[PDB]
Amino acid sequence: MVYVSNKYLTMSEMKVNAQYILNYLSSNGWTKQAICGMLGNMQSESTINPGLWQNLDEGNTSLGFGLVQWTPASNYINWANSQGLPYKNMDSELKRIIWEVNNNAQWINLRDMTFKEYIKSTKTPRELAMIFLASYERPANPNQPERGDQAEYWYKNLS
Ligand SMILES: CC(=O)N[C@@H]1[C@@H](O)[C@H](O[C@@H]2O[C@H](CO)[C@@H](O[C@@H]3O[C@H](CO)[C@@H](O[C@@H]4O[C@H](CO)[C@@H](O)[C@H](O)[C@H]4NC(C)=O)[C@H](O)[C@H]3NC(C)=O)[C@H](O)[C@H]2NC(C)=O)[C@@H](CO)O[C@H]1O
């Protein structure tokens, strides 16, 4: 059971999605820390909503979409379509992230950590949130410490 929509999710809704993601990526060998650092980013990017378009601008494929706000959205949507997966879909988005780890896409090593190091890391969810921000997300504004607070909130509050 997950929320998928073009709307900002409440804390309770985010928690449902966030536990789903933790379960899913644990089976694909990520640490709880690495997953929570990424969750702290996804909260700021999309309120952890796989259905969410940047500015709630539905159908604008030039801008951000989905859990991590793939920009331009077409980078991701093209991949889903080309792969025969529905793009507006929790699992399709997690499959993209796994595909990126596997093919060393998206990640730029700015912090002397590779993506494959990242998903096996037991550094703090705060430290990982900051590394994921700098290496994977890379938004115009870089000092977004909120993302680390959030990573710690999910690590505490999920199972
Ligand atoms: C206002 C705001 O911040 N909007 C947010 C989005 O910016 C953000 O999405 C992320 O945006 C950045 C910057 O536009 C983007 O980072 C760029 O990624 C490309 C890789 O595709 C890099 O370009 C390549 O560089 C290498 C080496 O120089 C070349 O070999 C290659 O040819 C280049 N490819 C092309 C086609 O350009 C850029 O160097 C790099 N720029 C920066 C500043 O790092 C991220 O990939 C975007 N993130 C995601 C997840 O897609 C989004 C997420 O925070 O949120 C919006 O709010």
Curated annotation (Swiss-Prot):
Name of this chain's protein: Morphogenesis protein 1
Active site: E45 (for lysozyme-like glycosidase activity)
Residue numbers binding substrate: E45, T71, Q106, E137, R138, P139, A140
UniProt region (Lysozyme-like glycosidase), positions on chain: 1-159
Localization per record: Virion
Residues of the full protein shown: 1 to 159 of 365
Cited function: May serve as a plug to restrain the highly pressurized packaged genome and thus would be the first virion protein to contact the host cell wall, degrading the peptidoglycan layer and thereby facilitating viral genome entry into the host bacteria. Acts probably as a multifunctional enzyme that degrades N-acetylglucosamine polymers (in vitro) and cleaves the peptide cross-links of the host cell wall. Essential for the tail assembly.
Protein family membership: In the N-terminal section; belongs to the glycosyl hydrolase 24 family.
Domain of life: Viruses
